[PDB]
Design a protein around this ligand. Sequence first.
Ligand code: SF4
Ligand code: SF4
Ligand code: SF4
Lengths: 182, 209, 114, 77, 118, 186
Amino acid sequence: QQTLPVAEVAQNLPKKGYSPFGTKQSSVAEWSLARLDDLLNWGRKGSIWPLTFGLACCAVEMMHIAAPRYDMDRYGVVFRASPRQADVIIVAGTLTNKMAPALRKVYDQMPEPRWVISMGSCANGGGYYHYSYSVVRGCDRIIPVDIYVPGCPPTAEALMYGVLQLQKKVKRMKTLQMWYRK
Amino acid sequence: DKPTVRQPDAVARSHLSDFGRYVAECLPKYVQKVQLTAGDELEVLIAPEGVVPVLQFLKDHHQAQFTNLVDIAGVDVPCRKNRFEVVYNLLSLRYNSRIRVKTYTDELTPLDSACEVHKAANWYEREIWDMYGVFFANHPDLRRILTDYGFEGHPQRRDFPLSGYVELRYDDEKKRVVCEPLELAQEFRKFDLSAPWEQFPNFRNANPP
Amino acid sequence: AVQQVRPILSVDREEARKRALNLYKAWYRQIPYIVMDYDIPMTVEQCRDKLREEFVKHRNVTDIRVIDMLVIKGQMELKESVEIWKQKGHIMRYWKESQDPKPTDFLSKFIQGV
Amino acid sequence: LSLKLINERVLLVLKLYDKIDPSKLNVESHFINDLGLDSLDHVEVIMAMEDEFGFEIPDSDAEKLLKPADIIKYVAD
Amino acid sequence: IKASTGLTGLAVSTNPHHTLSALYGKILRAVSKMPQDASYRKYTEQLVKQRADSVAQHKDITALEKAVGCGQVEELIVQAENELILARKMLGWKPWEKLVQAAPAKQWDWPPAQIMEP
Amino acid sequence: EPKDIVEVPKGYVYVNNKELSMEFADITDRAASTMFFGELLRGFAVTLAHIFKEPATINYPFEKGPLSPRFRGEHALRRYPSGEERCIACKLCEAICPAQAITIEAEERADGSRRTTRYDIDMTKCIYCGFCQEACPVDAIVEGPNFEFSTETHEELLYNKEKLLCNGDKWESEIASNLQADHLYR
Ligand code: SF4
Ligand code: SF4
Ligand code: SF4
C-alpha cells in the first residue's frame, strides 16, 4: 500500500492546490472549462441532500449524524423527503424483496446527477441476513452504488467519513472537461 | 446451598398443578393431556376441534379469566403425522399467571379460527397461514402478511430451503426487477454440530410408547 | 386406504369443480383491467392464454382438499391483483421472462454442461 | 322474443369464438360431446355470450347450458 | 357513588347489586340445564352461590368488593356477563362427554425423530 | 391544588388525575394564559435561552472521538514480536462467526507449521460482533481501532489475508496498546 510521504520528503512537496485538475491547462479554452468545471463541483459538493430513507437499524445512526454531536448540516447536508429534490440516497438497512421494487422506483425518480451511499452490512452485501429467503443480497444488485460504508451499524463518524468521500468524489467529476475532448 | 442452580418457585408450582387438574375435569371432551413444564409453566394439549371451546372457557370462566391472548406460535415437525403444531400463550391479569394450549394439525386440515374468543388473533393467524401454510377456517380475511406478494411456498416449514429458490435482480431490458433461479456466490456452509455422547440421561428413557 | 377428514371449503368434487370455474370467471373478467392498470408488455389475448396455460398445470389433481387449497391460493392472488398491491414486477413474474430457455435434448445439455 | 334475432346472436357468438368450426353449428349440437370443447373452453363461450347479450348468468343458471338449444331457450328470458 | 371507574371506557354502574343479581340468577338457570355429573356444573353452581349471596349480603359496593375481592364491582359485572356467554355456548358443545378425538401415536412426543426399539 | 378524580394506591403514579378547579382565582389564571399566549411564552423563553449555550458540535475530522479501548472496528491479523503470524488456522473464528463471513484454508507449511494459505473476511457480511476476537486462542484476529475504511467499490470490501496482514502492521502499535489495557477484563 502506498504509504504517506515522510516529513522531510513532504517538506519539499508543493502546496497541493484546491482544484484536482491543477492549473496546467495548455489553452485558454481548456483552462476556462477546468475552472468552470470546479464551479459546478463546488456547487454540487457543497449541498448534498439525502432522501431520508431510513429502512432499518442503520437508520437510527443515520439520525445521529444529524444530531448536534456531528451535525451533518455543517457540511451543507440537509435531509429532504421528496425524491425529486433529493440528490443523494443513503440506503441504510436490509433491502428485502418486498422493498426492492420500491427502492428502484424511488431511485429512478431521483433526478441526475444522483449518487447512492450504502450504509452498513445489510445494504452492502446482505449483511447478517445474507442467506435469508427474502433478502436482496446487497443493494448494488438493484441500484448502482457510489460509496460503501461498512459497519453494523456504521459509527456516526464512520458515516461522516463516508459522506466526505462522496464530496471528494463529487469534487473530481470531469463533466465539462470531458465534453471538450468529446 | 448451590448458587448456580436456579431455585424453583414452589408456591407458583403448587397453584398451577391443582388448577391444571381443574381444567381436565371441566373439559373432558377436548383436553387430551395436561402437563407442568420444567419451567413451572402449564401446558394443555387439546384436540384440534377443542380450540374455540377451550379458549372460550379459559377467557370467560371466573377461575380462569385468561383474558389476554399473547401469542400464537406455529411449530413444524416433519416426523409427526400431523406435522404442524399451534401454541397459544395466554395471560391472566387478574390471577397473574400464564397457560399454554397446544394443538396439532396436518398440512391440509383447517384449524378453527379463534378471532371470536380473542380477536387479537386476527394477524397472528394470518402469520401462521403465511409462514407455515396452516389454513384457518372462518377467518375474516386470510391473506399473506409477511412474505412478498406472489411468493410461492411457505418459508418456515422445515422442508423449505433456507435461501429459497429464487432471487431478485434488476434487468435493464425489462425496466423492472425480475426473479431468477437462486445462485449464491458462497454456499451456506453447514456445520455438523452433533455431539456423539449423550449428555442429558434423564430424557433417554422418557416418553415410553 | 381411506381416512375421515375435515373438509376445507367443499364437500364434493362437483362443488370443487364449481368453485374452480368461478375462479376462472373472475380472472377472465379481470384481464382487461390488469392490462390497463399495469405498465407491462403483455396484451389481453396473451394473458388470457396464460390463464388457460396454468389452470392446465394442475390437470391431474384429484384430491378435493388439494383442489380447495389451490382455489384458496388462486383466489388470494386475484384479490391482490384486483387490487394493485401486486406491483408491475410481480404480475410479469407469471411469465419468467428473464429466464431464457434451457435446451432439453441430451446433446445440447451435454455440450452446455450440467 | 325476437327469436331469430336471438338465434343469430347466439350462433354468432360461436362463430365469432375461435378454436371452433362453423360445421355442426346447429341448435341441437352438444357443446362437450358434439362440439367437443374443453370444460374451460365451454366457460369461455357462454361467458363470452353474456357480453354480446349484456346479461349476467349465475353459475347455477349457467350450469344448465349444455346446447345452443339450452342457451337460446334460456336466452329468451 | 364512585366519581370515576379509573378505567377508560368503563362507566360507573347504577344499581350494581341488581345487575349482578340478575346475571348470577341467569347463570344458575343456564347451568341447571347441564347434566348433574358435569364437573363444570358442580363448580360454577358452587361458585355462583358464593358470589351471589355476597351481592345480597352487602349493600355497600365498597364493602362488596372487599367481601368478594376480584376487582371493582364494574369488573364483577363484566365477569358475570361472560359466563352467561360461556355457559350458553357450552350447552351446545357438550364438553362433558368423552374425549372427542383420541390422540395419535407420537403426536405429543419430545424430542422428536428418534428410533424407538421394540 | 385541586383534588384527584381517582384515589391512588401505593407504588403508582398518575399522569392525568388532578381535576380542574372552578374558583375564579384559578379560572382567570387559566383564562389569562389561554388569552395572552401565556403557555407559549415560556416555551419561547426556553428556546431563545439555548442560543446562549456553547453548541455541542465537534469539528470533525480535526476533532473527533471519543471512543474506548473496547471499540470494535476493522479487522487485522496480528503477529508475534518475532514477526511470525499468530494465526495457526485453528478455525474457531470461522465456526463462531455468526455471519459466516470468514473463510479459511490451511496447509502444512514448508517448515511444517500449521498455517493458513487462505484467510478471507467478507466485510459486507460481517456484523462486527467481535466473537472472532474472543474465540481466537492466540489473539491472532482482532477488530482494530479503525472505523474509516469506506470504499468506492464492493470488491474492495472483501479482505484477503494480505490485506488483513497489512492492517495488522499499519495498526500494530495501537492494537497492542488496546489489548494490554483491556485483556484483564476479557
Ligand atoms: S447493517 Fe447492522 S445496523 Fe445496519 S440495518 Fe443491518 S443489522 Fe442493523
Ligand atoms: S466480528 Fe463477528 S461477524 Fe464479524 S468476522 Fe468477527 S465473528 Fe464474524
Ligand atoms: S481463531 Fe485465531 S488462530 Fe484460529 S483460525 Fe481464527 S485467527 Fe487463526
